[PDB]
From Swiss-Prot:
<comment type="subunit">
    <text>Heterodimer composed of a glutamine amidotransferase subunit (A) and a GMP-binding subunit (B).</text>
</comment>
<keyword id="KW-0315">Glutamine amidotransferase</keyword>
<dbReference type="InterPro" id="IPR029062">
    <property type="entry name" value="Class_I_gatase-like"/>
</dbReference>
<dbReference type="Pfam" id="PF00117">
    <property type="entry name" value="GATase"/>
</dbReference>
<comment type="function">
    <text>Catalyzes the synthesis of GMP from XMP.</text>
</comment>
<dbReference type="InterPro" id="IPR017926">
    <property type="entry name" value="GATASE"/>
</dbReference>
<dbReference type="InterPro" id="IPR023686">
    <property type="entry name" value="GMP_synthase_A"/>
</dbReference>
<keyword id="KW-0658">Purine biosynthesis</keyword>
<feature type="domain" description="Glutamine amidotransferase type-1">
    <location>
        <begin position="1"/>
        <end position="185"/>
    </location>
</feature>
<dbReference type="GO" id="GO:0005524">
    <property type="term" value="F:ATP binding"/>
</dbReference>
<comment type="pathway">
    <text>Purine metabolism; GMP biosynthesis; GMP from XMP (L-Gln route): step 1/1.</text>
</comment>
<protein>
    <recommendedName>
        <fullName>GMP synthase [glutamine-hydrolyzing] subunit A</fullName>
        <ecNumber>6.3.5.2</ecNumber>
    </recommendedName>
</protein>
<feature type="active site">
    <location>
        <position position="162"/>
    </location>
</feature>
<keyword id="KW-0547">Nucleotide-binding</keyword>
<feature type="active site" description="Nucleophile">
    <location>
        <position position="76"/>
    </location>
</feature>
<keyword id="KW-0067">ATP-binding</keyword>
<feature type="active site">
    <location>
        <position position="160"/>
    </location>
</feature>
Amino acid sequence: MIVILDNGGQYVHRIHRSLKYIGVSSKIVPNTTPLEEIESNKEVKGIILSGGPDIEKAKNCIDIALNAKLPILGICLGHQLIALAYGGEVGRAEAEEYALTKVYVDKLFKNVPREFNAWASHKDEVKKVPEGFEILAHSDICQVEAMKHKTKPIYGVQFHPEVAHTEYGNEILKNFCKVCGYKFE
């Protein structure tokens, strides 16, 4: 089971519907869900922090990003929240509207080409990557399209892998799920 923190965005049900596509069970919980509740359910093998319009209403994800023992994928707001949580920096970015963005893989991306089109907003972006993290990908307009913690199973993506408009979206979700112990036969 994967747990999805609902940070309020339009694409949270889509996360559940894409994980289903690749045969991964998931459930949406409100983003005020204490970390203890999530980890007491031993079926939960990973966490997704969803997209969301307001970082100041998703403060509890910072607690989850720092303290969880399970793997974490942050998506857009969630990517920014992981960055903030380890003492990285977030700021206004280049363009608010969801658009197709060419992403360059600089190093999650098993079975994915070096360039691919991703569905992304750039209202906000990680300005400073925290200690213990490294950039996995970038676009022309965004230095940090994806990142991961070097030793902890924690991943962020500025773009929405759950949206069909993202090429290899389900492959990216599936690579995350493999880290969460999921077998794909």
